[PDB]
Amino acid sequence: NLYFQ
Amino acid sequence: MDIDPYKEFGATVELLSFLPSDFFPSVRDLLDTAAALYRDALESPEHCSPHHTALRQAILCWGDLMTLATWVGTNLEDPASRDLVVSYVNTNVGLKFRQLLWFHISCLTFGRETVLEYLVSFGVWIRTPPAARPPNAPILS
Amino acid sequence: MDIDPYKEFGATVELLSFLPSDFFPSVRDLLDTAAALYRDALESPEHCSPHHTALRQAILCWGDLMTLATWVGTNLEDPASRDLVVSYVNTNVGLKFRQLLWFHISCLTFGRETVLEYLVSFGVWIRTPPAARPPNAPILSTLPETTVVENLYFQ
Amino acid sequence: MDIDPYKEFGATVELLSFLPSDFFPSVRDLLDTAAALYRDALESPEHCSPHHTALRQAILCWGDLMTLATWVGTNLEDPASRDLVVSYVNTNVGLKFRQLLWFHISCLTFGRETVLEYLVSFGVWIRTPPAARPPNAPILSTENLYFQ
Amino acid sequence: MDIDPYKEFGATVELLSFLPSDFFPSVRDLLDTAAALYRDALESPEHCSPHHTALRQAILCWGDLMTLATWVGTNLEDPASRDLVVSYVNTNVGLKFRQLLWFHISCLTFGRETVLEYLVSFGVWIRTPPAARPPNAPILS
Amino acid sequence: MDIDPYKEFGATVELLSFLPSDFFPSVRDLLDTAAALYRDALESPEHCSPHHTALRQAILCWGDLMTLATWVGTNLEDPASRDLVVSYVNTNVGLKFRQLLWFHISCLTFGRETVLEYLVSFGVWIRTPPAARPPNAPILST
Amino acid sequence: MDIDPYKEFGATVELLSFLPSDFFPSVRDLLDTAAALYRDALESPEHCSPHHTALRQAILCWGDLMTLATWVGTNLEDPASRDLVVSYVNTNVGLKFRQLLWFHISCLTFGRETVLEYLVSFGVWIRTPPAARPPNAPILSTVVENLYFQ
Ligand SMILES: C[C@@H]1[C@H](C)N(C(=O)Nc2cc(F)c(F)c(F)c2)Cc2c(N3CCCC3=O)cnn21
Ligand SMILES: C[C@@H]1[C@H](C)N(C(=O)Nc2cc(F)c(F)c(F)c2)Cc2c(N3CCCC3=O)cnn21
Ligand SMILES: C[C@@H]1[C@H](C)N(C(=O)Nc2cc(F)c(F)c(F)c2)Cc2c(N3CCCC3=O)cnn21
Ligand SMILES: C[C@@H]1[C@H](C)N(C(=O)Nc2cc(F)c(F)c(F)c2)Cc2c(N3CCCC3=O)cnn21
Ligand SMILES: C[C@@H]1[C@H](C)N(C(=O)Nc2cc(F)c(F)c(F)c2)Cc2c(N3CCCC3=O)cnn21
Ligand SMILES: C[C@@H]1[C@H](C)N(C(=O)Nc2cc(F)c(F)c(F)c2)Cc2c(N3CCCC3=O)cnn21
């Protein structure tokens, strides 16, 4: 996963 | 290693230490706030955000620290020595976790940029001698 | 509040505790490995991943624990009470941090699903009585970046 | 030579002294503010502004004054004389650097012309008997070019 | 905070220190020179340049140090004690300020790159044992 | 100056210190290997490579250190100090040179990248409790 | 093995020994010079040159030597024997490092061929009895032709 915040 | 817990959130230990010790709520009040506001998210199988990942660990680390400190406190038989532990915790790791829990709870509630600008405003305000200090302290919103 | 540090990572305290307590490296050895493999990432201004964020706190929390434990050691009169602190952290909290540091360091190196599969495999292998135990223990191994299908497709 | 540190900044020692002594933060609080707001600028290889250049020197100068005052205090035989040195510093050179550090930090933070106007406003406010003094003191609201 | 007063002028404390202490003029002689060469600019209500601004502070700072040492000196009965103060300011802060004032005064007369080139030339020259040392020392132009 | 002898070769002191101290051969065994593998190159008038240049200096530095340490131990007849200098050489400077000699010797044989992968692999393997430790240690190959 | 530290640089120990032991600065002065002149390059992740690689090692070896010598002196309490290590360093290892530091530091500034011609000129000059010795010592460094090719 490529985690966006 | 030299890890600063604030650095991946755009702050630093030195910056959080610009707020005076008595600015922060107690650790108990911060933990009651994290629960009242974020319990469901903190307990979920979702990461939610990097602040939630950090907050989760800090809450658990504080429980570990308190278990240890309680174990020492209760097994001491001298009120002087018990007071020395409490004082040492309140001065050192208690202040650290009040800074860190306040930071993550306030970032999640008001936003990181708002929190950082506020932090520096308050720090300036509180250092101003009372005769010249603005009547209204800065507010987060 | 009831927070499981592994829940957001797809695992649970009960699952990590399926590995025997003596499987895990020491904390010191885990911390050396985190540095050797991930120092630049752990120290950088970037989140990098939830594992990195959690690993950062775990490392600092161990240092908090050790600072407090050492300061308490420094105030004790009795030599036997110092060695009861040592036993105290290394029984109660040492195991818990060895699990957590191993988990994030290994997930960072091999991936969550590889690690959880290996974990239940090793747990079954080590509970097998040695006379019945298979000779080759499970091991974590890195997945290739390019499938064999992909290399053959471009021949 | 007769150099007034404020003159290139459009002020004078006489004008800063129009503020009462207990207006200014402590030197320790001013040095933590300079760090919290400007540390990266203060430590860079860029001039940034004439306030930065002055603040860099003033911070290092206070460091020199403290080293000197500490060596004096260490080497005095009388504990009462150590107190006199501390008192003398706070009433004199300490007040001077509270003024100076406050000035440069406030000019960076709020604007130099704003600070100069504010100074005269506050000195007038605080000299007013409290029965006539307006309830709210004046307050201020939160890279430039500079001519030689 | 870790501030190096030379860094905004392209140099460092370590570099100035490469010159030996007896290379620099005396503080009194450096303040006479600042006055003879630069007084009107130093005294004017204009910035002039970053070197002027720094030089203005260094001069005043030395006055501060000297005012404090003198006030101490006049409240000391023993002439040997005033001597130990005199020796001390010249030993410690004296060198620091001879470096700084020399640097600003020379940069204003001969320019930064000329001064830095010359500085390492002389530092190399003077570390050469005298039997091998070239006759012409480097000079500024 | 703070110089890290490994930096220009893509490594650090901290990284080499990830191998346990008893991983490395004796300095004497690394010196005999450097001679068996590279004596002709080390003694020639050509640079050969930065690793050769660095290895040449470390060999000679060890020579200077032992020359100084023997003169100390030999002018001290008391066995306590004669043996205390050996202990200090073993615990301190010896380990530094075993690291550095092994680094350069292995790099000349297998290359920097193969050596650094190996180092980290072995550093993890040897920290693994024997019950879980994979049967075959990593090695250096091709 | 028999390694000459100067051989890969086109010199030899015997030739550096042609300069007298009081031609060279102290090791301290050569180290402060190496820093003032080459610090950035010495501390960089780039090889830069074989002189930089070798100079890097010598700096650190001097560190090793002085740390060993200090720990010995720290654990010698008799006033006489602490001076014994200083003298030994001064007489033996210090001169070798002063040669080597000077060689690399000068080679990086002026070039091998310049340094070696200088070295031999100076060793001749200083051996010359003062009555006959030229006034100016050698130093480390056409009009018609330059104008002809304008
Ligand atoms: C940041 C300042 C001040 C300095 N405040 C805090 O720090 N509150 C705080 C208290 C906690 F218990 C806690 F866990 C926490 F993280 C922060 C309280 C505050 C507000 N609001 C918004 C609604 C109610 C309120 O007071 C606005 N601006 N401000
Ligand atoms: C200038 C007056 C008053 C007189 N204030 C100061 O002088 N603050 C001050 C404190 C320092 F620590 C310091 F280093 C400094 F240079 C100035 C404080 C102030 C503000 N603000 C803006 C955000 C919070 C606040 O209080 C506005 N108007 N005012
Ligand atoms: C830098 C060197 C040398 C080492 N000199 C100094 O440092 N002079 C110096 C003396 C001061 F009193 C002072 F305050 C200051 F900043 C510098 C003197 C000098 C000259 N010239 C030019 C005109 C006359 C002269 O002597 C040229 N090159 N050189
Ligand atoms: C080789 C001779 C002489 C014999 N000189 C040295 O050996 N200088 C020396 C000093 C050190 F501190 C050091 F670390 C080093 F490597 C060399 C000094 C020198 C120069 N120059 C050039 C600018 C200033 C100067 O004097 C020219 N020719 N010569
Ligand atoms: C790096 C590991 C292991 C950890 N080995 C060493 O470190 N050998 C070592 C011994 C020395 F004396 C020396 F000077 C040196 F630089 C290295 C030995 C080794 C081999 N090979 C290849 C042929 C025979 C062999 O055993 C392959 N992989 N490995
Ligand atoms: C999970 C098992 C076993 C059970 N191993 C561990 O747990 N290693 C370990 C050691 C640490 F010091 C540490 F901090 C950590 F997180 C993990 C070691 C291991 C490997 N590899 C890969 C290269 C070398 C090696 O042995 C593969 N599979 N396995």
For residue E128, what are the contacts with CB-CB under 8 A and spacing of at least 6? Answer: E134, G25
Find the angle CA(D127)-CA(D128)-CA(D131) to the nearest 5 degrees: 145
Quick one: CA torsion of B24, B27, B29, B31, rounded to 10 degrees? 120
Axis-axis angle for helices B93-110, B79-91 (nearest 10) = 40
DSSP string, C69-132: HHHHHHH-S-HHHHHHHHHHHHHHTHHHHHHHHHHHHHHHHH-HHHHHHHHHHHHHHHTS-TTT
- From C119, C140, C141, the mutation candidate for ligand 6 (largest count of ligand atoms within 8 A of CB) is C140
Separate counts of helices (H) and strands (E) for chain E: 6, 0
DSSP state of D136: S
Tokens of C33: 């490995």
For residue B6, what are the contacts with CB-CB under 8 A and spacing of at least 6? Answer: B12, B13, B15, B16, B100, B103
Q: What whole-number distance in Å separates Cα of residue E41 and Cα of residue E47?
A: 9
- Tokens 């009372």 appear where? B130
Q: What whole-number distance in Å separates Cα of residue B47 and Cα of residue C53?
A: 11
Q: What whole-number distance in Å separates Cα of residue G55 and Cα of residue E93?
A: 34
Distance from CA of D139 to the nearest CA of B (A): 7
The sign one gets for the Cα dihedral E120, E126, E131, E133 is positive
Q: What whole-number distance in Å separates Cα of residue C148 and Cα of residue C141?
A: 16
Axis-axis angle for helices G94-110, G27-42 (nearest 10) = 40
The sign one gets for the Cα dihedral E72, E73, E74, E80 is positive
SS3 string, E111-138, reads CHHHHHHHHHHHHHHHHCCCCCCCCCCC
DSSP state of G11: -
DSSP state of C24: S
Is the separation of the CB atoms in C89 and C65 below 8 Å?
A: yes
CATH no. for residue E28?
1.10.4090.10
**B53 at the A interface (CB within 8 A)?**
no
DSSP state of D22: G
Is the separation of the CB atoms in F42 and G1 below 8 Å?
A: yes
Tokens of D87: 């008192």
Q: What whole-number distance in Å separates Cα of residue F85 and Cα of residue F74?
A: 11
Chain A hits for C47, Cβ within 8 Å: 3, 5
Is the minimum distance from the CB of F131 to ligand 6 under 6 angstroms? Answer: no
Q: What whole-number distance in Å separates Cα of residue E69 and Cα of residue D75?
A: 13
Angstrom distances, CA of residue C128 to CA of C114, C116, C124, C133, F57:
21, 19, 7, 5, 55
Tokens of G80: 């006489």
Q: What whole-number distance in Å separates Cα of residue F1 and Cα of residue G39?
A: 7
Is the separation of the CB atoms in E11 and E116 below 8 Å?
A: yes
Which chain B residue lies closest to A4 (C-alpha atoms)? B49
The sign one gets for the Cα dihedral G43, G45, G47, G53 is positive
The upper half-sphere exposure of residue D94, i.e. CA atoms within 13 Å in the direction of its Cβ, equals 17
DSSP state of G149: T
Tokens of D113: 């012309």
Closest CA to F68 of G89, D24, G110, E13: G89
**A1 at the B interface (CB within 8 A)?**
no
Among G22, G36, G37, the residue with its CB nearest the CB of E129 is G22
**B109 at the D interface (CB within 8 A)?**
no
Is the separation of the CB atoms in C17 and C59 below 8 Å?
A: no
Closest CA to E119 of E91, E100, E92, E138: E138
Closest CA to B45 of B56, B35, B37, B34: B56
Number of domains within chain G:
1
Tokens of D81: 């004389």
Tokens of D2: 């007769």
Is the separation of the CB atoms in E47 and D8 below 8 Å?
A: yes
Tokens of C137: 């223990």
Chain C hits for A5, Cβ within 8 Å: 47
**G22 at the E interface (CB within 8 A)?**
yes
Ligand 5 atom closest to the CA of F102, numbered from 1: 16
Q: What whole-number distance in Å separates Cα of residue E72 and Cα of residue D135?
A: 44
- Tokens 């009547």 appear where? B135
Within 10 Å of residue D56's Cβ, how many Cβ atoms?
27
The upper half-sphere exposure of residue G136, i.e. CA atoms within 13 Å in the direction of its Cβ, equals 6
Tokens of D82: 């150590």
Amino acid letter at D131? A
- How many A from CA of D66 to the centre of ligand 3? 32
Angstrom distances, CA of residue C70 to CA of B62, B74, B97, F129:
17, 18, 19, 27
Q: What whole-number distance in Å separates Cα of residue F17 and Cα of residue G83?
A: 35
Asked whether D and F share 3 or more beta-carbon pairs under 8 angstroms, the answer is no
Q: Are B127 and D29 in contact (CB < 8 Å)?
A: yes
Tokens of E90: 């010249």
- Tokens 């005199």 appear where? E86
DSSP state of F29: H
- How many A from CA of E18 to the centre of ligand 3? 17
Asked whether C and D share 3 or more beta-carbon pairs under 8 angstroms, the answer is no
For residue C141, what are the contacts with CB-CB under 8 A and spacing of at least 6? Answer: C110, C114
Q: What whole-number distance in Å separates Cα of residue D51 and Cα of residue B49?
A: 40
For residue C74, what are the contacts with CB-CB under 8 A and spacing of at least 6? Answer: none
DSSP string, chain A: -----
Is the separation of the CB atoms in G45 and F8 below 8 Å?
A: yes
As to burial, measured by CB atoms within 10 angstroms (0-12 exposed, 13-18 middle, 19+ buried), residue D104 is buried
Report the first-to-last Cα separation within chain D, whole angstroms.
20
Amino acid letter at E84? L
Tokens of E19: 């010159």
Is the minimum distance from the CB of B102 to ligand 1 under 6 angstroms? Answer: yes
Is the separation of the CB atoms in G37 and G104 below 8 Å?
A: no
- Tokens 């100390």 appear where? F72
Strands (E), chain D: none
Find the angle CA(G70)-CA(G76)-CA(G79) to the nearest 5 degrees: 105
Q: What whole-number distance in Å separates Cα of residue C28 and Cα of residue B116?
A: 35
Amino acid letter at B112? R
For residue G104, what are the contacts with CB-CB under 8 A and spacing of at least 6? Answer: G34, G51, G54, G55, G58
Within 10 Å of residue B50's Cβ, how many Cβ atoms?
21
Is the separation of the CB atoms in C108 and C82 below 8 Å?
A: no
Backbone angles phi, psi at B94, to 5 degrees: -60, -45
Report the first-to-last Cα separation within chain F, whole angstroms.
38
Q: What whole-number distance in Å separates Cα of residue B115 and Cα of residue B109?
A: 9
Amino acid letter at G145? E
Is the separation of the CB atoms in D20 and B130 below 8 Å?
A: no
Separate counts of helices (H) and strands (E) for chain F: 6, 0
Angstrom distances, CA of residue E99 to CA of B124, E59, E112, G102:
35, 12, 14, 27
Angstrom distances, CA of residue E62 to CA of C127, D51, D65, E44:
78, 19, 10, 19
Tokens of C114: 């590889």
Q: What whole-number distance in Å separates Cα of residue C90 and Cα of residue C87?
A: 5
For residue D118, what are the contacts with CB-CB under 8 A and spacing of at least 6? Answer: D110, D138, D140
Is the separation of the CB atoms in B71 and B64 below 8 Å?
A: no
Q: What whole-number distance in Å separates Cα of residue F122 and Cα of residue F138?
A: 6
Amino acid letter at C54? A
Closest CA to F107 of F46, F36, F37: F37
Using CA positions, which residue lies closest to atom 27 of ligand 4? G140
The residue segments making up the domain with residue C5 are 1-155
Q: What whole-number distance in Å separates Cα of residue B53 and Cα of residue C51?
A: 9
Is the separation of the CB atoms in B65 and B93 below 8 Å?
A: yes
Axis-axis angle for helices D50-75, E50-74 (nearest 10) = 20
Axis-axis angle for helices B50-75, C50-75 (nearest 10) = 20
Helices (H), F25-74: 27-42, 50-74
Among C31, C44, C56, C100, most B C-beta atoms within 10 A, so best to mutate, is: C56
Axis-axis angle for helices C94-110, C27-42 (nearest 10) = 40
Quick one: CA torsion of G112, G118, G121, G127, rounded to 10 degrees? -110
DSSP state of D24: S
Find the angle CA(E75)-CA(E79)-CA(E83) to the nearest 5 degrees: 100
Tokens of D136: 């709210």
Q: What whole-number distance in Å separates Cα of residue F43 and Cα of residue E24?
A: 48
Q: What whole-number distance in Å separates Cα of residue E141 and Cα of residue F141?
A: 62
**B63 at the A interface (CB within 8 A)?**
no
Angstrom distances, CA of residue G126 to CA of D128, G94, G97, G118, G122:
84, 21, 21, 12, 6
Tokens of G82: 């602490």
Is the separation of the CB atoms in D32 and B18 below 8 Å?
A: yes
Q: What whole-number distance in Å separates Cα of residue F72 and Cα of residue G86?
A: 12
Asked whether F and C share 3 or more beta-carbon pairs under 8 angstroms, the answer is yes
Q: Are B124 and D33 in contact (CB < 8 Å)?
A: yes
Axis-axis angle for helices C50-75, C27-42 (nearest 10) = 130
Which chain E residue lies closest to G30 (C-alpha atoms)? E127
